[PDB]
Paper text:
In contrast, cryo-crystallography has effectively addressed such issues, leading to the seminal success of synchrotron structural biology. In this study, we introduce a pragmatic high-throughput RT data-collection method, Cryo2RT, that takes advantage of the well established workflow for synchrotron cryo-crystallography. The procedure involves crystal cooling in liquid nitrogen (LN2) at the laboratory, shipping to the synchrotron under cryogenic conditions, as is commonly practiced, and thawing the crystals on the goniometer immediately before X-ray data collection. Here, we used endothiapepsin (EP) soaked with four different fragments, thaumatin (Thau) and SARS-CoV-2 3CLpro (3CLpro) as test systems to show that RT structures can be obtained after the cooling/thawing process. Our Cryo2RT method applies to conventional single-crystal data collection and achieves a comparable throughput to cryo-crystallography, enabling high-throughput fragment-based screening at RT: a highly sought-after method in structure-based drug discovery.
Therefore, we set out to perform similar experiments using conventional single crystals mounted with standard cryoloops for three protein targets (EP, Thau and 3CLpro). Cryo2RT was also applied to Thau and 3CLpro cryoloop crystals, yielding high-quality data sets after the cooling/thawing process. In this study, we systematically observed a slightly lower resolution for crystals collected at RT compared with cryo temperature, even though the same dose of a few hundred kilograys was used.
Residue numbers in the entry: 1 to 207
Write the structure that this text describes.
């Protein structure tokens, strides 16, 4: 499956793509403002994620740090990034179908649109100014708007037991972005696409 990753932000982002235990394609790359990077994701990929990282520094070997979404200091991500990270999430070729969503469960850093480039389903978007509107207690000093589980580490926010409900903090993400997951047990906003669809992830889709 192809995923065209486009940076429409006025700032550079370092795109990342991983399934948690391995990179997807090269795993990461710098995207200056306006740049497009097309990756190939193996059919059958389950639990894949794409995200942006901001304010990165990498040396010649691809080692360094990002202020948001850092994946163990690597340019080429092999693991998930450090919150806050707006997430484009996907599972492909799952009994003949693809499943996509945007999630704020690990916070928000950069606005994003995640849409198919092929027929048969709609895209999902979280493009509101969540960083600007972020509640004081969730603001990440390193940049971004943290989720409440990251900040407070309680069973209720982290949905440790599976009993959790919505919270004042999850409702903030849900109000700004109704089409993204705001907590672990949120009412799903996952879209079913034909199996083997192709996609485009656009950072800062509106500006």
């Amino acid at each position: 499956a192809t995923f065209e990753i486009v940076n429409r932000c006025s700032y550079t982002v370092w795109a990342a793509a991983s399934k948690g235990d391995a990179a997807l394609d090269a795993g990461g790359r710098q995207l200056n403002s306006g740049e497009s990077w097309t990756i190939n994701v193996e059919p059958g990929t389950n639990g894949g994620k794409i995200w942006a990282r901001t304010d990165c520094y990498f040396d010649d070997s691809g080692s360094g740090i990002c202020k948001t979404g850092d994946c163990g200091g690597l340019l080429r991500c092999k693991r998930f990034g450090r919150p806050p990270t707006t997430l484009a999430e996907f599972s492909l070729n799952q009994y003949g179908k693809d499943y996509i969503d945007i999630s704020n469960i690990k916070g928000f850093n950069v606005p994003m649109d995640f849409s198919p480039t092929t027929r048969g389903c709609r895209g999902v978007r979280c493009a509101a100014d969540i960083v600007g509107q972020c509640p004081a207690k969730l603001k990440a000093p390193g940049g971004g708007c943290n989720d409440a589980c990251t900040v407070f580490q309680t069973s209720e926010y982290c949905c440790t037991t599976g009993k959790c409900g919505p919270t004042e903090y999850s409702r903030f993400f849900k109000r700004l972005c109704p089409d993204a997951f705001s907590y672990v047990l949120d009412k799903p906003t996952t879209v079913t696409c034909p199996g083997s669809s192709n996609y485009r992830v656009t950072f800062c889709p509106t500006a």
